[PDB]
Design a protein around this ligand. Structure first.
Ligand SMILES: N[C@@H](CNS(=O)(=O)NCc1ccc(S(N)(=O)=O)cc1)Cc1cc(F)c(F)cc1F
Lengths: 724, 724
C-alpha cells in the first residue's frame, strides 16, 4: 500500500486538531461530535456547556458560533457566504444562555459584514451596509454609529480589498477597549481608487455574465485614504447621532500617502496607533491618551517612536504589534537590531531609545504573552535551525534568565511549536506541528508542568504503519559566506545510489520559508510515495527569519536573486548523487508561479518542464501595498526600470526550451486573470507552444471541492508524462 | 516532398485570384503590382488608369480605394481598424482625377464608420458618429441628415451588432436610388437591448483591463427596434435640417417584434422593403412608390406579397432579394416550391400569385443578372450534384429555353462557378473554384464566346507537380429514402486496402455544405498529405441546397439530427475498408464545435478524441436572430424544452470516454467565452479531465497572424498524439 492521489484528494488519512477557546484564566471550550463542553485546566473535570441537539430544530445550518465573554449569550453564524480571503457576509441569531430563548426583538440583520462581542460582557458591534451599529443588550434596538457607509466607496469599521489582504489580514477594522468602553475604528475612502473588472459566469442558468467591479489599487495607482475614529459606547442616547472622536495622524505622515498599519489598546484609556508611509521604509507609532475633561484624544509628540530601515522595508510584512505592561507606560515590540536580526525591544513611552532583551544569530518570531513576571515568545534559536519554532520564557527582572519550555519535551518528534495562553497566562496549550505527527498538550505556567496529552494522533499513527510513507530531509548548503536551507521529500526506501526525478517546489517570496520542520500530507507526499519523485524546496535570498541580511537582499530587485537561487538550488541537488538531471521539474502558485515562470524563461536549460499556477507576470499588475513595499513606485524617478526588467513576458522566447503548463482561475480578484492572459499572449507572439487551463469562477485558491480535485489531477498527468 | 504544416501556415503555395470591378458595360478595373489599370473587354486594349507611384508621397498606407462611378474622384481608405465581422472605422481622403489634387477643404472626418458614392456621379453618403452626412461635391461642406445618432444606442445608416451579423451581413444600413436621387436608410434603437460585457487586455503596457460592452440580444431577450427613412439628396439647403420621409411598416408586422430584412430599389421612385416577424416563419414584401405631389411614400396593400413556410423558417437565412424588370412592374425572386425546392418565381406587382420559371429536384442558388432578353442564375442542377455550381441563362420569352453556359467548358477541372457581370450584362467573368485549380475567364453575353483566359494558375500547377498532393473524393451514401452527400480528403497514393485514421471535419449548421467540389489548400491538406489522415465531411439533415425536406429537418430540434447524422456518417466510413476504427477523431469551429461537442458527449464510443473551437454550448447564450430562426423563443409556451435538452453541459459525464481539447478566444463577441466557460465548468464538476486553451484578445476568428499559427500548430500536436 502507498500514498495515492486519492488518498490526498479524498482526505483518507486525517490529521487531528485540538481547537480550544479560553474563556477564563483556567477554563476553555471544546467542541465534541456536535457538543460544546468546557474543560477545567485545574481539576480536569468537564461539563456539557451546550448540548448537540439544542439546535436540531433551529432550521438553519450553523456555520460558526461565538460566546459572549460573560457567558450570557451565544452568537449563531449561519447563511455564510465568502467574499475575499477573510471577508464574508452572514445572518445572525442570538440565543440566551441564562434563559433558553432565541431573541426575536431587534435582531442582527441579514447580510451582516462583521460582528463582535465586547472583550467583557455582551456588547455587540456589528458592521452592516458598511456602517457601524452597536447593541449594549441583545434585545434592545441598536445605535447606528456611522452614516457615511457607501458600497465600494466608504468603509466604516471594515477593510476594503487592499487593507484586508495586504495590511490587517481580516475583514474587521474596529477595536474594542479592554473593558469595552470604547469602540475604536478605522475609515476607508476608495473614492478615486480604480476598479478591476472581471466576468463571473455563475450557473448555466444565468444568461448574461455578471461583471465584477472591485476597488483595487495596482502598483503606483491611487490608494484608498484612511481616517481613524474612537467612540464611547456608554454615552449613547436613543435620540442622538453618536459622537465619534477622530484621531488624526502625525504630520510626518500627512505630507504624503499613508496607511494605518496597526491598532493596539494599551490600557482602558490609552490606545497605540502605527502609521506607515506609502514608501514603506519609514514608520511611526503614536500613543494616544484620553483627556477626560475634553472628551478628546491626545497624542503626545514626546511619546512617538520612529521605526525605519536603510536596507529595505519596515517589518516582516508590517511593523510588529506592541505588548504593553499592565499599567501601560512601557511596551515590548519586535524590531531589527544593529546586526539586522528581529529581537525584542523594551520601550518606555517617553524615551525614544529602547533596550534589546534578546540577542543572537536568530530571530524572535512573536511575543505570545506578557505577565508581571514573564514574557513569552517564540523563536528559531534552538539548534541554529530556522525551520523550527520553540516556546521560551524570559525573566522580566533578569534578562539573562531564559528557559526554553518546549525544546526538550520530544526532540525527535517535535520542533515546530505554536502556543495558546489562558487569560493572564495561568495555562498554555502547546501545538507541535512536526517533524513527527501533530502533538497537542496542556500546561500550567506556574511550575511548567505538563498536565495532559490532549491529542497524540495515535489513530492516524496506526494507519500510517500500513502505508509506505516518504521521509523528509532538512539540511542546508553553503553558497557564499552564508548557509541557505533546503528540504526534501524523499520517496519511501530512498536509495541514494539511484537517480531520481526531482520537482522543485517554489514559493520564494519576501519572507517566505518553504524549508521548515512541519509535518505535511499534501500532493508532494503522493509524488514521492507513489511516483518516487523527490520534491525539494529551498529558501534562497529574500526568505525570512534569517535576518535582514538575507531577507532584504531581494529589496527593489524582485524576480532576480530569489529566482537565480532557485536555479542554483537545482544545480546543487544534481551535484548530489540521487538526481536524474534530465528529469528536473519546477512548480509554484502565486509568487511561486511567478518564480517558476521567470525560471523557465531564464534559458538555464536545467529544467525540462514547469507548472505556474495563478502567477504574477508583471509587477505593475499586482496591488500597490504589496508590490511597492518591495519595489517602490513604478516611475522613472523611483523604480520603473526594475519593474520593466522583471516580467515574464520579456522571457517569452526561452520557453521554446521548456514545457509549460499555465493555470489560472478566471474569477481571481487577487492575481488577476489578466496576468496569465498577458503571459499566454507573449508566448503565442513568439511561437512557443505550451499548455493552458482556466478554471471558471475559481478564485486565487482554486479551492472549490471539484476544482481542487480537477486541478491537482491535471497537474499529476502533466508531471507524469513530463517525467514519463 | 510533401504538404507540411508550414506550407499551410506560411502560405507557400499561393492560389491566384483575378479581382476586377466593372465601371461600365464593357470596361473593368484591374490592380497590378501596385498599379490600377483598366481593361477593355471589346478590344482587349488596356491603359494605365492610375500609376503605382502616385501615392509614394501620400504618407499613409492605403488600405482600400473606391472610384466614383463617373471616374471623377478616387476615395482613399486608410487608418483602417476592424470592429466586428464587416464593421470598421477609417480615415478618408479624396484625390481629384480630373485634376491631380488631394482635396483639403471640408474633408471626411477621422473615425468614419461607412462611406459610399452614389451609383451615378460622385455624391457621398457617409456615416460618422452614428449620424448620416451627405456631400454632393467632394470640396463643399456636408449636409448632416441625422441628429439622433448616439453610441451603442441609435444607429443611423449603419447596423448594430445583431443586424450586421445575422441579417444584412454588412456594416452599412443605407441604400442609394439607381440615379442617386434618394438615400434610403434604416434606423436602429438598441435602447433596452442588454449588454454583453467582456475584458480586453491590450498591450502589456495597459495596467487595468478594458471592459467591452456591446448591445447583444441573446435568445429571447429584448431586440433592437427598427424604423425606415428615405431622404431626397437634391433639395438640400445649406440652412435646413433636411427632411427624412419615414416609411412605416405593414400592420401585420406592427402587432409584435419585427425585423427589417431586405431593401431593394425597383426603379427611380419605386423601392421594395421586406419585413420579417420575430417568429421567422412569416414574411411580407411592401412595394412603395413616390407621391410626387406629397413628397410621401405609398405602400399599396394591393402590392404586398406574403412569404411563409409551414415546415420551418422563411428563406435560407433570410428571404431572397428581388430582381425587378427595367420598368419595375414585375420581379423575379427565389422561393420554395410546393415540393419544397428553391426556384425562381415570376411576380406581377399587383398579383398575389407568381409563376415558377424553373423546376426540378435541385435548387436555384441565386439570380445573377436580368436583362430585357435573359435572366442569369446559378444552380446545382448539373449531374444532380449539389456540391456543384453552374451558370445558366433562361429565355424570358420562352421558359423552356435553358442553356448551361458553363457546364461543358471543362467538366474535369471545373464544377464550381461564380460570375461577375458588366453593366446591363454585356460581359461576364467566370470564376471556377474547383475541383481542379481555380480558372478565371472572360466572356461576352451576346454570343457566349470565351474571349480570354484571365488566370489559369499554371504558376501554382508547376509547384504542385513537385509535391505529394492528396486527392478529393466526393460521393454520396443512402441513409433512408435519401442520398446524403459526403467528401473525403484522401492521402497521396491512397491504398484502399489499408486502414487509415479518420478526422471528421464538422460544421453541420442549418443550410451548411461541407461536401462540395471546391479546390482548397488548408489544414486538412497537410493532415492527409503528411500525416496520412483521411479528413472527411458530410452533409446530413439540416444541410442546404437539397430542398426543405432536408434543410427543415433540423427545425426546432437543434443539436439533435445534425449531430446524430455525423455519428452515423462515421459508422458508414468504417463500413468501408480504409478506416482504422480505433483512431477516429472529430473537429469543429463555431456551430461545428458545438456539434463536435454534442457528439463527444453522446456516448456513441465511435470517436477517440475531438477538438471544439469557439463552440456554442447552450442555445440561450447565442443571439436571438440566429437562434430563434431555428428554435423559436426559449419559453415554456413556445420551445424552452428543446433549448434545455440541447446543451453540451448536459452531456458532461460522457466526456470521460473521450479526449477533448476546448479552445476559445477571450475577446469573442460572437460566440462568447461564456459558452466555453460553462462547458469547462460542467466537465470539472463531474470530474472529466480534458485540454483547454484560451487565446487572449482573439475574436471568433482567432485570425491574428500569430494566433492562427499557434492554434493550428497546437491542434496538430493534439491530433498527432491522439492518433499516435
Ligand atoms: N497577498 C500577499 C500577502 N499574502 S498574505 O496576506 O498571506 N501575507 C503573507 C503572510 C504570510 C504569513 C503571515 S503570518 N507569519 O502572520 O502567519 C502573514 C502574512 C501574498 C501574495 C503574494 C503574491 F505574489 C501574489 F501574487 C499573491 C498573493 F496573495
Amino acid at each position: 500500500k502507498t500514498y495515492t492521489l486519492t488518498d490526498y484528494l479524498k482526505n483518507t488519512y486525517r490529521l487531528k486538531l485540538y481547537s480550544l477557546r479560553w474563556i477564563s484564566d483556567h477554563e476553555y471550550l471544546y467542541k465534541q461530535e456536535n457538543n460544546i463542553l468546557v474543560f477545567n485546566a485545574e481539576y480536569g473535570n468537564s461539563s456539557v456547556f451546550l448540548e448537540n441537539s439544542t439546535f436540531d430544530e433551529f432550521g438553519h445550518s450553523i456555520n460558526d458560533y461565538s460566546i459572549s465573554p460573560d457567558g450570557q449569550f451565544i452568537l449563531l453564524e449561519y447563511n455564510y457566504v465568502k467574499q475575499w480571503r477573510h471577508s464574508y457576509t452572514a445572518s445572525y441569531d442570538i440565543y440566551d444562555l441564562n434563559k433558553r430563548q432565541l431573541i426575536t426583538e431587534e435582531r442582527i440583520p441579514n447580510n451582516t459584514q462583521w460582528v463582535t462581542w465586547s472583550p467583557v460582557g455582551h456588547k455587540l458591534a456589528y458592521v452592516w451596509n458598511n456602517d457601524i451599529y452597536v447593541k449594549i443588550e441583545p434585545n434592545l434596538p441598536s445605535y447606528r454609529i456611522t452614516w457615511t457607509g457607501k458600497e465600494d466607496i466608504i468603509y466604516n469599521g471594515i477593510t476594503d480589498w487592499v487593507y484586508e489582504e495586504e495590511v490587517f489580514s481580516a475583514y474587521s477594522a474596529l477595536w474594542w477597549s479592554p473593558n469595552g468602553t470604547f469602540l475604536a475604528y478605522a475609515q476607508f475612502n476608495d473614492t478615486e481608487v480604480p476598479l478591476i473588472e472581471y466576468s463571473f459566469y455563475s450557473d448555466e442558468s444565468l444568461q448574461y455574465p455578471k461583471t465584477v467591479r472591485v476597488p483595487y489599487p495596482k502598483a503606483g495607482a491611487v490608494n484608498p485614504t484612511v481616517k481613524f475614529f474612537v467612540v464611547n459606547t456608554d454615552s449613547l442616547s436613543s435620540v442622538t447621532n453618536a459622537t465619534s472622536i477622530q484621531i488624526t495622524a502625525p504630520a510626518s505622515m500627512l505630507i504624503g500617502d499613508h496607511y494605518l498599519c496597526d491598532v493596539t489598546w494599551a490600557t482602558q484609556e490609552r490606545i497605540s496607533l502605527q502609521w506607515l508611509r506609502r514608501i514603506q521604509n519609514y514608520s511611526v507609532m503614536d500613543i494616544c491618551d484620553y483627556d477626560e475633561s475634553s472628551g478628546r484624544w491626545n497624542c503626545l509628540v514626546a511619546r512617538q517612536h520612529i521605526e525605519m530601515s536603510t536596507t529595505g522595508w519596515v517589518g516582516r510584512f508590517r511593523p510588529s504589534e506592541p505588548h504593553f505592561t499592565l499599567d501601560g507606560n512601557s511596551f515590548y515590540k519586535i524590531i531589527s537590531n544593529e546586526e539586522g536580526y528581529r529581537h525584542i525591544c523594551y520601550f518606555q513611552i517617553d524615551k525614544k531609545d529602547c533596550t534589546f532583551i534578546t540577542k543572537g544569530t536568530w530571530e524572535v518570531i512573536g511575543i505570545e504573552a506578557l505577565t508581571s513576571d514573564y514574557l513569552y515568545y517564540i523563536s528559531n534559536e534552538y539548534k541554529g535551525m530556522p525551520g523550527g519554532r520553540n516556546l521560551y520564557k524570559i525573566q522580566l527582572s533578569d534578562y539573562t534568565k531564559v528557559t526554553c519550555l518546549s525544546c526538550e519535551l520530544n526532540p525527535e518528534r517535535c520542533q515546530y511549536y505554536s502556543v495558546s495562553f489562558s487569560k493572564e497566562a495561568k495555562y498554555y496549550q502547546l501545538r507541535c506541528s512536526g517533524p513527527g505527527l501533530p502533538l497537542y498538550t496542556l500546561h500550567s505556567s506556574v511550575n511548567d508542568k505538563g498536565l495532559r496529552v490532549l491529542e497524540d494522533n495515535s489513530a492516524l499513527d496506526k494507519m500510517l504503519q500500513n502505508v509506505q510513507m516518504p521521509s523528509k530531509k532538512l539540511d542546508f548548503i553553503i553558497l557564499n559566506e552564508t548557509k541557505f536551507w533546503y528540504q526534501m521529500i524523499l520517496p519511501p526506501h530512498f536509495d541514494k545510489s539511484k537517480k531520481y526525478p526531482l520537482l522543485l517546489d517554489v514559493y520564494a517570496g519576501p519572507c517566505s520559508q518553504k524549508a521548515d520542520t512541519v509535518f505535511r500530507l499534501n500532493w508532494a507526499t503522493y509524488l514521492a510515495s507513489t511516483e518516487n519523485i523527490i520534491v525539494a524546496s529551498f529558501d534562497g535570498r529574500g526568505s525570512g527569519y534569517q535576518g535582514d541580511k538575507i531577507m532584504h537582499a531581494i529589496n527593489r530587485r524582485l524576480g532576480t536573486f530569489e529566482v537565480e537561487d532557485q536555479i542554483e538550488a537545482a544545480r546543487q541537488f544534481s551535484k548530489m548523487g540521487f538526481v536524474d538531471n534530465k528529469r528536473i521539474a519546477i512548480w509554484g502558485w502565486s509568487y511561486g508561479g511567478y518564480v517558476t515562470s521567470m525560471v523557465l524563461g531564464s534559458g538555464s536549460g536545467v529544467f525540462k518542464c514547469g507548472i505556474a499556477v495563478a502567477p504574477v507576470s508583471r509587477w505593475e499588475y499586482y496591488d500597490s501595498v504589496y508590490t511597492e513595499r518591495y519595489m517602490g513606485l513604478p516611475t522613472p524617478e523611483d523604480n520603473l526600470d526594475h519593474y520593466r526588467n522583471s516580467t515574464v513576458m520579456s522571457r517569452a522566447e526561452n520557453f521554446k526550451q521548456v514545457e509549460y503548463l499555465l493555470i489560472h482561475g478566471t474569477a481571481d480578484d487577487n492575481v488577476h486573470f489578466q496576468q496569465s492572459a498577458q503571459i499566454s499572449k507573449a508566448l503565442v507572439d513568439v511561437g512557443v507552444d505550451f499548455q493552458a487551463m482556466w478554471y471558471t469562477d475559481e478564485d486565487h485558491g482554486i479551492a472549490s471541492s471539484t476544482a481542487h480535485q480537477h486541478i491537482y489531477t491535471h497537474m499529476s498527468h502533466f508531471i507524469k508524462q513530463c517525467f514519463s
